[PDB]
Ligand binder design. Structure first.
Ligand code: NA
Length: 121
C-alpha cells in the first residue's frame, strides 16, 4: 500500500544515519575490543555474568536487516556494549578503560544523532 512504503521509506532513512553513527562510534574503538561477540569458548562463564551480550558486529547484522525502528533501540544496544564490559571487567583493566572512553566519545555522536532524527523526522 502507499503509507507502508512511506513508512518503509522512513525506516529506510533511519538505518544509514544510524549506520553513519555506527561507523563513527566504532572509530572511537581503534583497539577493536568491542568489534566481535565475547567468545564462550574463551570465556566459558560469560553467560553467568552477562544476560544480554552485545557488540558492533551483532548490531551491524541487526542494522543490515532493518531491525532498528528508532534511535532508542540502537542506543540500548550501544549501552549494552559499554554496560556489560564495565560489570564483567574490573576498574584497573584495559577493557573497562576502553568502555569508559567509548562512552564519553560516543555521547558526542549520539547527541547530534538525536538532533538529526528529530529534525529530519
Ligand atoms: Na564488576
Amino acid at each position: 500500500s502507499m503509507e507502508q512504503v512511506a513508512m518503509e521509506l522512513r525506516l529506510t532513512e533511519l538505518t544509514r544515519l544510524l549506520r553513519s553513527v555506527l561507523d563513527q562510534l566504532q572509530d572511537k574503538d581503534p583497539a577493536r575490543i568491542f568489534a566481535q561477540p565475547v567468545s564462550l569458548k574463551e570465556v566459558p562463564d560469560y553467560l553467568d555474568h552477562i544476560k544480554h551480550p552485545m557488540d558492533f558486529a551483532t548490531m551491524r547484522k541487526r542494522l543490515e536487516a532493518q531491525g532498528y525502528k528508532n534511535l532508542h533501540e540502537f542506543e540500548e544496544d550501544f549501552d549494552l556494549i559499554i554496560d556489560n564490559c564495565m560489570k564483567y571487567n574490573a576498574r584497573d583493566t584495559v577493557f573497562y578503560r576502553a568502555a569508559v572512553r567509548l562512552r564519553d566519545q560516543g555521547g558526542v555522536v549520539l547527541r547530534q544523532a538525536r538532533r538529526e532524527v528529530d529534525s529530519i523526522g
